[PDB]
Amino acid sequence: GSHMSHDAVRPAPGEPTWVDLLTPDRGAALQFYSALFGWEFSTTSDGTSPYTMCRLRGREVCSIGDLGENPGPALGGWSSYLSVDDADAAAAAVPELGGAVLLGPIDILAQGRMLLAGDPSGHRVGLWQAKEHTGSGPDDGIGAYTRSELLTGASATDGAFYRGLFGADFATESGTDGGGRRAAIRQVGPAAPSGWYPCFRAQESAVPAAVMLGASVLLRYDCPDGPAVVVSAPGGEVFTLLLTD
Numbered sequence: 164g165s166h167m168s169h170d171a172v173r174p175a176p177g178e179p180t181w182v183d184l185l186t187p188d189r190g191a192a193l194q195f196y197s198a199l200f201g202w203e204f205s206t207t208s209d210g211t212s213p214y215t216m217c218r219l220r221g222r223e224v225c226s227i228g229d230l231g232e233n234p235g236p237a238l239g240g241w242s243s244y245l246s247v248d249d250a251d252a253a254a255a256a257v258p259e260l261g262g263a264v265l266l267g268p269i270d271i272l273a274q275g276r277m278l279l280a281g282d283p284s285g286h287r288v289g290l291w292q293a294k295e296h297t298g299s300g301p302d303d304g305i306g307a308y309t310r311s312e313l314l315t316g317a318s319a320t321d322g323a324f325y326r327g328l329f330g331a332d333f334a335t336e337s338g339t340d341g342g343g344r345r346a347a348i349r350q351v352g353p354a355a356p357s358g359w360y361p362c363f364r365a366q367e368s369a370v371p372a373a374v375m376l377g378a379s380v381l382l383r384y385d386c387p388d389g390p391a392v393v394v395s396a397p398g399g400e401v402f403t404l405l406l407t408d
Contacts (some may be wrong), residue, residue, distance in 0.1 A: 183244075262324060266278075310361070362391060
């Protein structure tokens with residue numbers, strides 16, 4: 164052990180951190196995404212590696228692993244994780260805002276604590292408490308992260324939730340226009356999908372490509388930053404495609 168330099172990204176709360184994707188069929192997943200955008204993968208010297216590191220033009224994208232048997236009715240797939248000032252406190256805010264803390268705040272190997280909330284169906288939604296220095300550095304191209312949205316049939320209420328995390332209640336109440344470079348609450352109905360779905364830049368030609376692979380659309384809406392469409396991948400996880408030329 165010894166002390167050395169370090170570089171952490173996203174010092175203040177509100178900025179994106181990372182997202183993990185759990186799918187039952189890793190082998191198929193790779194193919195799927197590969198045909199959407201063509202994200203590269205990391206090469207391991209050893210035999211069968213535990214997980215695959217998905218990279219694009221030398222830019223860490225994400226990691227995809229297997230699920231197993233009997234996943235559950237509603238997982239969420241892409242588990243959004245945003246840094247906060249005081250997760251411990253958010254736990255108390257959860258109920259106060261009209262939610263339910265599923266798991267946490269719990270310490271994991273004295274490295275970090277995370278928070279979970281949502282419905283008992285298995286919706287994984289919360290925030291991660293950054294303590295130590297973490298590395299990051301996304302890119303600004305087709306395929307890179309864009310933003311995150313909350314597909315719910317009660318935005319009126321969901322809004323209150325975020326409001327208490329980092330809205331007017333707090334000082335870090337960033338956000339003028341109707342969502343740009345931060346997470347926002349979206350309103351839907353019963354026929355439409357539900358759950359946190361991140362946004363991924365793609366081409367018009369990728370839209371149909373996905374279908375061919377065995378995916379289906381749920382809802383199609385417009386947005387100021389571009390057209391956004393919700394697509395349910397065969398794995399179970401749902402993702403949002405945003406066309407950008």
